[PDB]
Amino acid sequence: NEKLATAWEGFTKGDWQNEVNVRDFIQKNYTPYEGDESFLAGATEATTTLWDKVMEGVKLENRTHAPVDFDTAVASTITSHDAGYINKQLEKIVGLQTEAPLKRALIPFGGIKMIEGSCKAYNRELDPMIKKIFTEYRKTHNQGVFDVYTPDILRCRKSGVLTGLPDAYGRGRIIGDYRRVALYGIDYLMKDKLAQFTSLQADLENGVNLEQTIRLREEIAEQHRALGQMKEMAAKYGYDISGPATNAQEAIQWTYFGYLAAVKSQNGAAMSFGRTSTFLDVYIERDLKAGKITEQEAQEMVDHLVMKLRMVRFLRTPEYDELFSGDPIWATESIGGMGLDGRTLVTKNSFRFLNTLYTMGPSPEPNMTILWSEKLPLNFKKFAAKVSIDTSSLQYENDDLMRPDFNNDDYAIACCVSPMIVGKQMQFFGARANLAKTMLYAINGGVDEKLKMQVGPKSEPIKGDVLNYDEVMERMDHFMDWLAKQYITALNIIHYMHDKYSYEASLMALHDRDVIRTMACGIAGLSVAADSLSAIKYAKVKPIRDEDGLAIDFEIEGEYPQFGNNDPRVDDLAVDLVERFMKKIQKLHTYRDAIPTQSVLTITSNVVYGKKTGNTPDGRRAGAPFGPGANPMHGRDQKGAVASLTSVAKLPFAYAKDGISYTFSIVPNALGKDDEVRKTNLAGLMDGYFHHEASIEGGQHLNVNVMNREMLLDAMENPEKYPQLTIRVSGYAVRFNSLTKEQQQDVITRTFTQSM
Amino acid sequence: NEKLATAWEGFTKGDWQNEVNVRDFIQKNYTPYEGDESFLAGATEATTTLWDKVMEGVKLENRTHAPVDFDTAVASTITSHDAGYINKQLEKIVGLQTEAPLKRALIPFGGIKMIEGSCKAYNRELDPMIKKIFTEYRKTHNQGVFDVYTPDILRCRKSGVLTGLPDAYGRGRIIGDYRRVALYGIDYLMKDKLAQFTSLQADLENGVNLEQTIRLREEIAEQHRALGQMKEMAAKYGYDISGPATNAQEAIQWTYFGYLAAVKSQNGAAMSFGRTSTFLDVYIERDLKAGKITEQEAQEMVDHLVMKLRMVRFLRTPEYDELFSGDPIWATESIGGMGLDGRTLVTKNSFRFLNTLYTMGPSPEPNMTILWSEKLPLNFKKFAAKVSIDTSSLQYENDDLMRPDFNNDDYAIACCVSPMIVGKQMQFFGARANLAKTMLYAINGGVDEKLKMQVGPKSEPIKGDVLNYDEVMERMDHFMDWLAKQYITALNIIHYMHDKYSYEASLMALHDRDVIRTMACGIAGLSVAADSLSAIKYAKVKPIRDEDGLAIDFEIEGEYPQFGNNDPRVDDLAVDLVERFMKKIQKLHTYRDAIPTQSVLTITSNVVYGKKTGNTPDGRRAGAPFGPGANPMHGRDQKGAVASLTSVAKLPFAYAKDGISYTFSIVPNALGKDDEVRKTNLAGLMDGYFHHEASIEGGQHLNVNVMNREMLLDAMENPEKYPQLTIRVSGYAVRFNSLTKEQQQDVITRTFTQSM
């Protein structure tokens, strides 16, 4: 075609010009960058003007810990709202979820109850019509799930053994390749989908997997229809995106537009952006070299785009707020990484993105993630580290581990640590299960230690004055079998219903015809679990039973090894647990045959599950929060950074393919006297942690907080002083002021590494 | 329980008191009746007052050939409308679909387009909100089907080879056991459903047929929820139906209430009542013997119930009107029959029902069907015949054939001739395919003779001056293979979508947990097909091709045998076709593994398909309607009743389990000089037609019209003279005045048997 020729003028040819292959395009067009940050430009006046205006609303949010405003009588769709601006005269990249900045929408297909809850919470009246429609006419995801749930599953939800699963909010964990829009334009993609639709006809007529193929055909039709609405959406903003982006400003706008449709139609917990910085660099480079845009203009565009990612909002309930604290979005962007061909995927745009942290200050969103490799340009390693030291707003994932695992250099990170090959893979989100309570149950014969009711399988509680490790471990193993069963069953119900009542058409429309699905199960409280085993194994744990023989407390005699001090005695146990559970869920059948995977991730579930869990063998008191993700319990890792890093890296990514989250907080001085020593040290630390070999797997993820516990205490009292203070808390970042007093409590009481 | 004890006081005990078993209850409680009609009472004043009022609206309908009125801004559900009456002071049995008599509702879940079509047709404005909701928020059955259809299927729909399938209206063909409500009361049934729901938990947790079991659990939850709404519905009328009916008036009211919920929530083509007359007789008998009700009071209750069945209405489009002419409902009631234990299921109530034809005159609804047996009490045989002779409002089905086939004496008739064991079986309606056009296609290489476009598989048209039977038959066989494929594929799509977007919860809630499903495929134009083969085989058929070699007409030389004259030369061919097609669809995979079945049924499809079919080999001119159901072509059966009856009965019910419809019209005198001779003869005729043996299968169905072609001609000009004139037209009855001039045309031009 000649339209494609004009737009792609200058680009190197390859398969990507005949089929949808974004990876290929990037491969033979991107310009690797090994230079430094000296070329970076600063914020333009419009950028600052716009951002400041927005910050006014962000202050209001943190202050009231409630949305700035939200819809009350409009059901959100890709085309439901009119164009919305901060200031149309200033914006270089446009597009808002609703007609106003930060005004949250109503995404009813997930369930009308959560919306009523939100309304009641923020003192607002849900429009009666909207309510009638989504209770009587359009059945929601929520309704379908609770119509099929078992009383067992409900008991678990209530007791805090299996709580917070995606049965009352968008499942998320899906990243459409929004780059496809910039590259090919809507029309081309629709024609491609039409072909995909037709490719299924044969199987249909021949009765081949009749029901599976009918479902897919309908899904594909919905995708095709979503694509067309994308155009209509863009059109409201005065844009025609039927053809491909012809320059940088459009590539960016076209890509964002793809994502915008997604966040206008689905309210998934995590609505990640993907791996786009390098892709977009191809269009920026071209415009720079042709002298069509300056460098400051390039940065301004990235700023306005990243600014919009800072404005993504979703109406949530209070229950949701404690499960996922900080008003998180997980507009995750995977930056850098190395190609399979040895070259670095780092580009000038890699820098421009991190630089938004300077042009517009620190921000928890987008959740910028560095795909780290020991072979990255040192120039970049240092800068990333500096930015971490400067803002504590970045996270790192082991690219030397994942790139070779997928044997693909175009995978991105969904939410926190869940990898997927862009446009070819997704996850069936499963939140996380309370592994700690599972142990207590094993000890108390399935009776919940707080509610004193039978939750797990009725069995005989462990007896004796002192706990025997082998016995406790066998009972626990049995209860894990039970946990796996309940957990997978719940997810099967959930994803069958989500596919039925809230299929993410606009996002799936930006994937291939056949998408790989994994059934991601999460494990919460891994450390309290492992330490508790250690206490029983390497010490004398004496259970204190109540009138009914229920173990409501434990007496410990003789110290024992704890997770995070690189002591194989505990560390081996944690690694064992990870293995055990993974091997168990692995046997169970799943919906759409999603391949079961595991992740040691918790988000704020460490606080919620901890709140609902009584005294444990490790010594943790009742109601105390577990450690975030795979972190050692608060303060138990006291042998320096390298010690704890080594422990967490011991955890097998081979049994936790959905990710292993580790939040690492270190005091400035522990990294050096000056920033030059700090950069080099931090980068060196990560090189060691992420070090990968055929013998040593290495760490998978790493949040990096560089600050003093004091600064936070100050922030707690002087909120208005650090409006943009950002911190990593569990695999994502949040503005410290967006947290609740109890959630801040969890933070300040966490481990602040003092040495190496 | 004591509630059940009070209500069932006097009833004989059996399993039915421990489990839901309506068949058992009837079995050890019903009172067989072998007496005559001398006990029948006449209409009460209220009955006449009420009916006359209603007839005013019926006149208006026939007159305007449009609904009296319909909703325009309300989505109908079980509980959407307030109580509606004709005259609450007079009605002994209450309940209307909407708040007013004959006012039709909006059943949007099937599709919003049909509703707009209806609105435009009857000059009314569809409420914009309703429209937005059912296009953007709640996806409809119609939308889902057309999103998955293939262009081939659409071509067939357009050419008239596969048209009128249930893709734009409720599939129907489902009969919930409404008797269950009267017998056990809602509560009991809900408790039973809850158990059914729980019975699936094990399989769920164990991954056993994961997706099938999740679907069923949700369906059962929807059923349970429907049952509760039934109570709320009844409550609007001042009734508490949570407990079982304690007397006759309640048994009737309770049963009707069950059906009412169904016709308030689903707009299926056929919404049949079931086999209830005898069941209800158990409650009437009890009340009579205890002197709680007189006989006239008994009749009055049956009148008011049957009156309501005469008021069932559904908003339809013009397209629908020509596919199913006469404003049909198919509120089919199966009367009489013999039990497996030799006794007759005939009761005094069998008579009371037929008697509504006298108390309130003739009516096409309910579609009362006599389950005929050579062992029925002669008293009943004569009366049925008299009623036929008197009103032409009854149809007959071979109970000596079906009862033993199902080996069950509690099966009922859905719509016209489709049998199902009440509450344990259903059909996936499939309308009917144009078998005639299939032949033309075989001759013209898949090119539609009217549209001159490629519809069937591209192949070489048969050449030569004269058609060879063996060649034509082989090509046709091949095209039948193709037809079967398209037909089943279309149905698979349709029922997958109907289960998804319009599951009939209120009806399924009155079935067992696991329901038997058949994939009912219909054959239209069987006779034009068979005769055309005969013309080619036993004569010289010379095709007249057009400029492109397309056979657009045929020249025949030398008469040939035709269907309906008991001549094995043609008759064998028809029987062969029936067999062939059945054997073909039998190999194909179906949705939910519905067992493919066949039926030679057409409804008004004989007119529509005929209109879209060109000149055929048998001599039928282009646009001429085929014969209804399995009837011989108009006027070709000229060897008397016995001759044609014998031909149709030759058709194998073993390959047409979904039914074989035969409309038999005979002039009064052909039956005798007086009614006594006429009764006896008519009954004797049927005994012969339905005669069943291990060697002779016998006829399956029989419509019976007793009148003179003249009376109709008079009726055509003097409409206001025969307001309630009812006639059998294809497996159902219609008021002659409800038909269009072109549809009446088909009638008057049909075969009027003159002799025996």
From Swiss-Prot, chains A, B:
One function term, GO molecular function aspect: formate C-acetyltransferase activity
InterPro entries: Auton_GlycylRad_Cofactor, Form_AcTrfase, Form_AcTrfase_GR_CS, Gly_radical, PFL_dom
Domain spans labelled PFL: 1-621
Gene Ontology CC, one term: membrane
Gene Ontology terms: biological process: glucose metabolic process; glycolytic fermentation via PFL pathway
Functional note: Catalyzes the conversion of pyruvate to formate and acetyl-CoA. In addition, may be involved in the control of the activity of the formate channel FocA, via direct interaction with FocA.
Protein family per UniProt: Belongs to the glycyl radical enzyme (GRE) family. PFL subfamily.
Miscellaneous comment: Several mechanisms have been proposed based on complexes formed with substrate analogs. After activation by the glycine radical, the cysteine radical, Cys-416, can abstract hydrogen atoms from the other active site cysteine, Cys-415, and from coenzyme A, and it can also transfer hydrogen atoms to product radicals. The other active site cysteine can attack the central carbonyl of pyruvate and covalently bind the product acetyl group.
The protein's name in its UniProt record: Formate acetyltransferase 1
Protein's organism: Escherichia coli (strain K12)
Lineage: Bacteria, Pseudomonadati, Pseudomonadota, Gammaproteobacteria, Enterobacterales
